[PDB]
Amino acid sequence: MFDKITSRIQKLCYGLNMDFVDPAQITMKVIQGLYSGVTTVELDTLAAETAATLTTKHPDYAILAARIAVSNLHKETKKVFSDVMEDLYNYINPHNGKHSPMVAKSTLDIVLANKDRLNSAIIYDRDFSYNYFGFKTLERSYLLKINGKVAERPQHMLMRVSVGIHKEDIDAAIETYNLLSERWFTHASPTLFNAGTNRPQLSSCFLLSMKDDSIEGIYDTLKQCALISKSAGGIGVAVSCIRATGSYIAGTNGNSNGLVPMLRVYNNTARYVDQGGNKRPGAFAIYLEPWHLDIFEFLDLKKNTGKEEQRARDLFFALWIPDLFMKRVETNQDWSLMCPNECPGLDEVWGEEFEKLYASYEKQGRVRKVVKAQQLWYAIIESQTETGTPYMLYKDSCNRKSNQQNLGTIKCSNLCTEIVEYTSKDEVAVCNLASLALNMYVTSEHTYDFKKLAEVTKVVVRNLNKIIDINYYPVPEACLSNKRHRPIGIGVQGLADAFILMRYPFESAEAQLLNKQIFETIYYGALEASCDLAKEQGPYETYEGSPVSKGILQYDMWNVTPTDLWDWKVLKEKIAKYGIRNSLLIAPMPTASTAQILGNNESIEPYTSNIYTRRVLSGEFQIVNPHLLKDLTERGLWHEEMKNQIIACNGSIQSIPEIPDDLKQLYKTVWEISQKTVLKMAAERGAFIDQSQSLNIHIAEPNYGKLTSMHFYGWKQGLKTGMYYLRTR
Amino acid sequence: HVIKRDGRQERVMFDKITSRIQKLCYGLNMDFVDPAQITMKVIQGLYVTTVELDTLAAETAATLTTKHPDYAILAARIAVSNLHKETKKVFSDVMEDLYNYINPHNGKHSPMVAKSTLDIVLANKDRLNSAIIYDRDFSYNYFGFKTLERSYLLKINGKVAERPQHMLMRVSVGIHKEDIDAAIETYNLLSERWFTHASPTLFNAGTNRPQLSSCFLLSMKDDSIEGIYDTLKQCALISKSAGGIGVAVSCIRATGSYIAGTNGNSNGLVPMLRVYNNTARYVDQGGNKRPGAFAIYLEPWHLDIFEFLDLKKNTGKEEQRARDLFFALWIPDLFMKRVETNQDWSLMCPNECPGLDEVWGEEFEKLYASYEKQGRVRKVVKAQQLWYAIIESQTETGTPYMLYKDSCNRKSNQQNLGTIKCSNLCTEIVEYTSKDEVAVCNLASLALNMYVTSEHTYDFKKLAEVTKVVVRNLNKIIDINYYPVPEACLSNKRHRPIGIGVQGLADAFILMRYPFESAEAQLLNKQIFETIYYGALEASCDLAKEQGPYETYEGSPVSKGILQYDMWNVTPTDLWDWKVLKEKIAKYGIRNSLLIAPMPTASTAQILGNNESIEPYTSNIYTRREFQIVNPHLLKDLTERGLWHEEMKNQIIACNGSIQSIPEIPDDLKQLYKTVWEISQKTVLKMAAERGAFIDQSQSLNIHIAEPNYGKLTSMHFYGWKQGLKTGMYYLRTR
Numbered sequence A: 001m002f003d004k005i006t007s008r009i010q011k012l013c014y015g016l017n018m019d020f021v022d023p024a025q026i027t028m029k030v031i032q033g034l035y036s037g038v039t040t041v042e043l044d045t046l047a048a049e050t051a052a053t054l055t056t057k058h059p060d061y062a063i064l065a066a067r068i069a070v071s072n073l074h075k076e077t078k079k080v081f082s083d084v085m086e087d088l089y090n091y092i093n094p095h096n097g098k099h100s101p102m103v104a105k106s107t108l109d110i111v112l113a114n115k116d117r118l119n120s121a122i123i124y125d126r127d128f129s130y131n132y133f134g135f136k137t138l139e140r141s142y143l144l145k146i147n148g149k150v151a152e153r154p155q156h157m158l159m160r161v162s163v164g165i166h167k168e169d170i171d172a173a174i175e176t177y178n179l180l181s182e183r184w185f186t187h188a189s190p191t192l193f194n195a196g197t198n199r200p201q202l203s204s205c206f207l208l209s210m211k212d213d214s215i216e217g218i219y220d221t222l223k224q225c226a227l228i229s230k231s232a233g234g235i236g237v238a239v240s241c242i243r244a245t246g247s248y249i250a251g252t253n254g255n256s257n258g259l260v261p262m263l264r265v266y267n268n269t270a271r272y273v274d275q276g277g278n279k280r281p282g283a284f285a286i287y288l289e290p291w292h293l294d295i296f297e298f299l300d301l302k303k304n305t306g307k308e309e310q311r312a313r314d315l316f317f318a319l320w321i322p323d324l325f326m327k328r329v330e331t332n333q334d335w336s337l338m339c340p341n342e343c344p345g346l347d348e349v350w351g352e353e354f355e356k357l358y359a360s361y362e363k364q365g366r367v368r369k370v371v372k373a374q375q376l377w378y379a380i381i382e383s384q385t386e387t388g389t390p391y392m393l394y395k396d397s398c399n400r401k402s403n404q405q406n407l408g409t410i411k412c413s414n415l416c417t418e419i420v421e422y423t424s425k426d427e428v429a430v431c432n433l434a435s436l437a438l439n440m441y442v443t444s445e446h447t448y449d450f451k452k453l454a455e456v457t458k459v460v461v462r463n464l465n466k467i468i469d470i471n472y473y474p475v476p477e478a479c480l481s482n483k484r485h486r487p488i489g490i491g492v493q494g495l496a497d498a499f500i501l502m503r504y505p506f507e508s509a510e511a512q513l514l515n516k517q518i519f520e521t522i523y524y525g526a527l528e529a530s531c532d533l534a535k536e537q538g539p540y541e542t543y544e545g546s547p548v549s550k551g552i553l554q555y556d557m558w559n560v561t562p563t564d565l566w567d568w569k570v571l572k573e574k575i576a577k578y579g580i581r582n583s584l585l586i587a588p589m590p591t592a593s594t595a596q597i598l599g600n601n602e603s604i605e606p607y608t609s610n611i612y613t614r615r616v617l618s619g620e621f622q623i624v625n626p627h628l629l630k631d632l633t634e635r636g637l638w639h640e641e642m643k644n645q646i647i648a649c650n651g652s653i654q655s656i657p658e659i660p661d662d663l664k665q666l667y668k669t670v671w672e673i674s675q676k677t678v679l680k681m682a683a684e685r686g687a688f689i690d691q692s693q694s695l696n697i698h699i700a701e702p703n704y705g706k707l708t709s710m711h712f713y714g715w716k717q718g719l720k721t722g723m724y725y726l727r728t729r
Numbered sequence B: 001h002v003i004k005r006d007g008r009q010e011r012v013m014f015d016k017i018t019s020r021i022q023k024l025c026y027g028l029n030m031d032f033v034d035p036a037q038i039t040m041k042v043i044q045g046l047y048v049t050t051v052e053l054d055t056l057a058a059e060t061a062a063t064l065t066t067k068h069p070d071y072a073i074l075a076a077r078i079a080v081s082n083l084h085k086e087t088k089k090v091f092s093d094v095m096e097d098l099y100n101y102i103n104p105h106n107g108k109h110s111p112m113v114a115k116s117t118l119d120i121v122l123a124n125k126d127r128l129n130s131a132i133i134y135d136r137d138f139s140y141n142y143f144g145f146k147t148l149e150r151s152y153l154l155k156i157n158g159k160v161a162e163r164p165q166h167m168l169m170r171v172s173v174g175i176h177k178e179d180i181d182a183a184i185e186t187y188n189l190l191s192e193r194w195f196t197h198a199s200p201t202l203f204n205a206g207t208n209r210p211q212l213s214s215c216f217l218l219s220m221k222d223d224s225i226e227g228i229y230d231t232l233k234q235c236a237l238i239s240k241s242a243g244g245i246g247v248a249v250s251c252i253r254a255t256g257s258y259i260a261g262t263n264g265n266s267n268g269l270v271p272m273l274r275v276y277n278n279t280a281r282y283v284d285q286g287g288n289k290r291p292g293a294f295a296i297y298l299e300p301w302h303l304d305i306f307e308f309l310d311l312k313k314n315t316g317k318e319e320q321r322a323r324d325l326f327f328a329l330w331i332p333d334l335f336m337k338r339v340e341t342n343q344d345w346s347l348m349c350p351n352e353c354p355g356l357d358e359v360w361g362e363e364f365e366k367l368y369a370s371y372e373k374q375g376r377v378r379k380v381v382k383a384q385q386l387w388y389a390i391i392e393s394q395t396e397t398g399t400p401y402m403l404y405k406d407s408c409n410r411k412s413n414q415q416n417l418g419t420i421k422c423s424n425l426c427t428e429i430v431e432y433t434s435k436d437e438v439a440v441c442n443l444a445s446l447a448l449n450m451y452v453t454s455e456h457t458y459d460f461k462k463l464a465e466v467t468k469v470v471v472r473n474l475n476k477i478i479d480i481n482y483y484p485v486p487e488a489c490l491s492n493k494r495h496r497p498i499g500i501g502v503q504g505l506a507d508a509f510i511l512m513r514y515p516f517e518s519a520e521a522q523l524l525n526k527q528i529f530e531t532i533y534y535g536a537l538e539a540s541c542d543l544a545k546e547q548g549p550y551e552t553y554e555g556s557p558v559s560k561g562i563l564q565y566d567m568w569n570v571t572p573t574d575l576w577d578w579k580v581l582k583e584k585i586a587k588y589g590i591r592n593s594l595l596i597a598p599m600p601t602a603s604t605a606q607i608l609g610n611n612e613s614i615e616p617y618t619s620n621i622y623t624r625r626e627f628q629i630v631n632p633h634l635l636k637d638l639t640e641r642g643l644w645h646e647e648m649k650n651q652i653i654a655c656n657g658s659i660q661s662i663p664e665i666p667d668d669l670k671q672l673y674k675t676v677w678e679i680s681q682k683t684v685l686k687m688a689a690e691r692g693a694f695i696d697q698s699q700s701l702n703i704h705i706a707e708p709n710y711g712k713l714t715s716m717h718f719y720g721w722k723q724g725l726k727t728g729m730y731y732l733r734t735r
């Protein structure tokens, strides 16, 4: 009756700790509602759900929940890759009768022609390694559906992504498949969505400089954003060269309306071209430089307060901050706002040069409004304490140390503030992204395995590089920028989890060492790989003239001298001889949902909480941090009463009477870590990061004193991105 | 004790001021020539200067208008000879200065006049200067002149540098270039006031990249964001260049429709207009006043019609409104029939039911009902439910405008091009548009009041004679004009359409002793539009005989020996031959695909002091700039009859501008100055129709209903439609 259920579940606890998992208990909760017309697929789904709500009891419950769902996904699915591929291709849309392939014919053909080999390279076992909430995330958006029914197993998608990247190179494809399915690294969603399909828009981010300062020019740029948006790209726009409000319009005879009305047009564009349908408007980051006359209004665009004609709330906002400005704040001083029309080219030059031009324009009469630099400064942080944005990036720091600095002045960053690339009136910059699951490399022996991490890294460089060519650009200028400079963005995830599996607290000296080494190898490995490609395919079109082409690597620009781990001199001897294929390589991105799939914490970030909520459909589930939960149960200290204590503390282990110290250090949240140490650790690794890194500052005691030193700390440390989002109480 | 305009300081003499006013009552109604009433007020307050005492002088004169409207042409004389006193005599010298302009900004040499256009003038200083009659400056009223000076006379910082005549001549040569014979000829009529070109021409003729046209009508390129944003660019560009637009938006697929290539669903008409609405607000020509004007045209079968009508309500969720825009329905006969016979009406998505907007009439019906048979219909409502929504919208915003797709298309000489998908911002222009043609139009309006005889009759012969110069002018503009988009140019050089309108029509009736709606007025209306047609065709033929026909002429209703009245099945009166005309078009043909189109004359009628366009006087008491004005003819008639006692204005205001009950005013004058609210709107409809048998485009036709409701509104629309008008309604004015 009820056994028929239990031992069906039991058949799937096939390695989980059974002193904490009790399948008899999932049965209890399932029993509620006896065969009142409940199908086996229905019942199976009820079980994994029940099982998942019991994660708070032990993490293995989540493994189980996952197994049950996967088990079903398999009983509802074709066991043969080549077969699914064909069906995906043969899809007829019932609504209009049109044959509408779901994979690319050419991908199918590379597959059919290699049926046996590929088909049998799959281990459908690997599907069972996803944890329940990762699986649900995949199932929701990542596995192609036919008629609302999921057609692909996860291994299928993974194999589609590989033979979509590597086309005829089966060996290469089969390599990538194993790396992907064994969870060593993953490509970014755009690639997981489109590799092997028709519009293979495989790129995650786009930068573009506003064209000219005209109505013709503005609208052209807009048209570009709409198209890029329709390709569900995320953009950054440099807006600083547009006339300010009041400025003269010579042709008509009147007065420029300023940045707000124009920005309000972009806003409603982001709402309109939102993939077609629902929430998450298009998503643009507008980048101002704080010398621009309109800066003060630009800062109130996201405020939750009326005069609707003066808000632009679906946009995102960032400061392209020059050094001069930071000085004039810290050493209390006047700051003079010009109109980029009275005062040309302020944006097209940086640092030593920049400061010359500004001070020139200034003591020359050509200011339009002089204010105390501190009055602006506080206006900034008044919106950040309010809205979390604008993001803080240091224009001069980005230009000072970008291997792309020979192309001209880098005019901004992207949506997520880790990409620092050049844009012109005829190049929109692009980036292809993947991430390393750093947790994967801590040895069965509590050491780290840098050889394998370098080794894997080398593969990722190859793939991302193929993508550049394979990829479909939304606008010709994107295709241009990309073939010209061939930049890529290698990134990480689970860096938190690495430490935890090493027993290293986050802010510990040992963790500060690994953080160095970990990003040291990745960069050593990517270069070695790019350098290899350069031997094979030639160095990129704009190579000679750049920093590395003049013998200077990233850390050189930071004056960082790296650890014994790798022999730079030898790698440098290679790059000297062949060059490198890729203009830039490393750009740790939020891993917003890729990490959510694999099971790790996002990016370079520590644990926000030790309990957190995931909701699935109508289901809502409290997830305790896995590492912690093993440590606690696997030590007898865990019970339910305690769960609620921790939950009574937003998620802090800290006050809990009977929890050991080595564990408290280990599992302290971010609201508990020295943010100064956070920025110091980003700075230290940033030396081996040729792009920026999406860096969030978590203050909880949300006062202006504590924040004003944060930014300046960030700045002086020499960071390109000082702040992504300000997350607070 | 007041410092004169020379530095040298004369005493304030209460006889000096008054006889200096006499000099300018050189043409005035004797019994109300009282400059002793004037200096009494001028010398009441004294706080030095001539120019400073001339302006108070000239304002206090304007304020004695509601005693007699000659005080208002005098009020203008003492502001215009004020202006005269320090604005250069000779014209060549003035056009000279404009070119030499070196502002102080980019302190850069910034020619306020065309390269060539003085090379022409000073190639002639003599002939053009000895053509100007600066006494014509004294023929304006105060408020004409103040709007003339406000923005039509070229300012050289603060000080306006042009005299009225000066700006007129500028235009005359900015149009005709080398042909001085026929540039003086134009200048004559223009300063004599027998017509005017529209503002853009008045503004830019003879300047350096001449924005010479006001109308643009385009249709939304394709149904893709690629094309949606191409159009938006176009509109921004046109907007920048002053241009008013109508856009045909019916081909964009409905809310909910499938996006194949993203596998999502269109957010629909609304989210997209919002981008347009904000564009209108952004590109408002630079800074202030009013958002670029875009009228948006939907056909009522489109799935998003009910939202469309909500866009203008100034009450509703923000991301669901679009108040800065303008809304017009492009209505097919089917829809009206379905309403009147109370049947269902099917809403479809242009992506599922393509090319509905591509065809009209007996053909559209086939395709549409075919779509019904195949059950490709997204929603079906009772046509009357849709109707009701329409006139809620009008009941509370005066829009949408009502044009009739099939009347437009069936009666257009542009037929042979395809289906006209929309009209212009003011609903007078009915022109073809396609993926790479945007229709333009160049306007001038004839001052109808000016063709009445001394002994009270109509001079149809000169009406005709003037009209001809006008078309040769408007046509010479097509070639001389500067277009903001390639497609605009292409369209115009292909089909070469021309928009000739009118003003001062109510005035024409009054001057002829006619109550607006009388049999006499009803005929004269028929007959003055009969002539304006014959006239402009006689010239368009003449032009084709000289320059050849226009590119797409052959195959058009005219090339098949069919003129507008023929397309309306109406017989012209005995007045003109027609038999003889059709014969010379049979051989030579015509240079202009379209000729006539009574646009409103918002600004240019205020200038020449005529009542707007083709309508009645709306009140007998109104307000310019504040300063008051009782209708010119009523006062004249009242005062010269003795009926106008001081008191009696307070009576006519009390009952909101009506003379229908003041027991003093005889039954005949009561007839003659009936205001619009007192005139049968169905008669103003029957008339527009009677008249528009001679207008090859449409005519912007406001409808006035004091206290509206579903009854009256449906009644008048259906009537307007039955009589076969292309524009059924412009604005609904209530109140």
Ligand SMILES: Cc1cn([C@H]2C[C@H](O)[C@@H](COP(=O)(O)OP(=O)(O)OP(=O)(O)O)O2)c(=O)[nH]c1=O
Pocket: A213, A214, A215, A216, A242, A243, A248, A249, A250, A251, A252, A255, A256, A257, A258, B240, B282, B283, B284, B285, B286, B287
């Ligand atoms: C036409 C127009 C321009 N602008 C602003 C947007 C741009 O930042 C700025 C440039 O407009 P432009 O279109 O470049 O104006 P222009 O053709 O007269 O060229 P210029 O004055 O440079 O000689 O003016 C408005 O804000 N509203 C408008 O209506």
Ligand SMILES: Cc1cn([C@H]2C[C@H](O)[C@@H](COP(=O)(O)OP(=O)(O)OP(=O)(O)O)O2)c(=O)[nH]c1=O
Pocket: A230, A272, A273, A274, A275, A276, A277, B223, B224, B225, B226, B228, B252, B253, B254, B258, B259, B260, B261, B262, B263, B265, B266, B267, B268
């Ligand atoms: C991409 C996109 C399209 N649309 C609407 C606007 C137009 O009505 C229509 C044009 O979409 P298209 O730009 O033509 O998108 P598509 O390339 O996928 O073309 P299709 O679906 O026709 O194969 O869809 C949106 O409303 N929002 C969007 O984000």
Ligand SMILES: Nc1nc2c(ncn2[C@@H]2O[C@H](COP(=O)(O)OP(=O)(O)O)[C@@H](O)[C@H]2O)c(=O)[nH]1
Pocket: A187, A188, A189, A190, A204, A205, A206, A232, A233, A234, A235, A280, A282, A283, A414, A415, A416, A417, A419, A433, A589, A590, A591, A592, A593, A594, A595
């Ligand atoms: N259009 C759009 N793009 C986004 C959004 N969020 C992130 N991106 C892009 O994704 C990049 C970073 O990858 P990430 O956010 O970690 O996503 P993931 O790796 O695919 O889960 C950014 O640089 C953006 O260009 C969004 O909400 N909308």
Ligand SMILES: Nc1nc2c(ncn2[C@@H]2O[C@H](COP(=O)(O)OP(=O)(O)O)[C@@H](O)[C@H]2O)c(=O)[nH]1
Pocket: B197, B198, B199, B200, B214, B215, B216, B242, B243, B244, B245, B290, B292, B293, B424, B425, B426, B427, B428, B429, B599, B600, B601, B602, B603, B604, B605
């Ligand atoms: N840009 C713009 N164009 C207009 C506006 N009103 C009218 N127009 C254009 O001018 C035509 C009507 O003429 P009218 O308003 O009387 O012009 P005017 O009397 O010469 O100033 C229309 O067909 C429009 O194309 C406006 O408010 N803005």
Ligand SMILES: [Mg+2]
Pocket: A213, A214, A251
């Ligand atoms: Mg410009």
Ligand SMILES: [Mg+2]
Pocket: B223, B224
């Ligand atoms: Mg399309």
